[PDB]
Structure formats: C-alpha cells, structure tokens
C-alpha cells in the first residue's frame, strides 16, 4: 500500500521516499528470499551509491554466499 | 555533500 501511495508523493521527496521504500521491500525480501533482496540492493546502489546500509547488507549477503571470500569488498567499504 | 542523502 505504501508503494502504491508513492505515486502520489511530491516530486521533491519522491526520490528519497522511493529509495526508503525500496530498501524496506529489499529487507522484507531478504527475510523471504535473498535473491530479490540482492537484486533490489543492486538497483538502489545504482540509484544511490552513497547509501551505506544497502551496501553493508549486499556485501554481507555476498559474504554469506561466498563464505567470506570478498575481503577486498569489505576493506573497500571500510 | 548530496542534499538527497541529508
């Protein structure tokens, strides 16, 4: 319902609220299915590379999948 | 520096 109502948001805050809602939906997916969560994580990272929680969660999921074989990514994020 | 991030 929040995503449906996002169409009525003022354009100034529309980008920020869309990013927030997509992050929340990606969290719900990560609870349900990690693949869609990672997809939305990539979508938001392309949309806003400056956000940290998205990158943290994406790298954390990658480390879970790669058994901590992305130490370079963690160092770069640090 | 991004007003969007702020």
Q: Which residues contact A24 (CB under 8 A, 6 or more apart)?
A: A2
Instruction: Find, in chain B, the residue whose alpha carbon is nearest to that of A17.
Output: B4
CB contact under 8 A, A15 and B4: yes
- Say which experimental method was used: cryo-EM
Q: Does B2 touch chain A (CB under 8 A)?
A: yes
CA distance A50 to chain B (A): 8
Interatomic CA distance for residues A49 and A73, integer angstroms: 14
The CA radius of gyration of chain B, in Å to the nearest whole number, is 4
Cβ(A9)–Cβ(A17) below 8 Å: yes
Cβ(A62)–Cβ(A73) below 8 Å: yes
Q: How far is CA A18 from CA A14, A31, A45, A70, A75, in A?
A: 6, 20, 13, 29, 29
């Amino acid at each position: 319902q929040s995503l449906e109502a996002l169409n009525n948001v003022s354009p100034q805050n529309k980008e920020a609220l869309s990013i927030t809602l997509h992050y929340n939906k990606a969290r719900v997916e990560e609870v349900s299915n990690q693949s869609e969560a990672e997809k939305l994580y990539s979508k938001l990272m392309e949309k806003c590379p400056g956000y940290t929680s998205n990158k943290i969660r994406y790298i954390y999921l990658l480390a879970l999948k790669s058994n901590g074989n992305n130490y370079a990514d963690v160092q770069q994020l640090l | 520096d991004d007003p969007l991030l702020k």
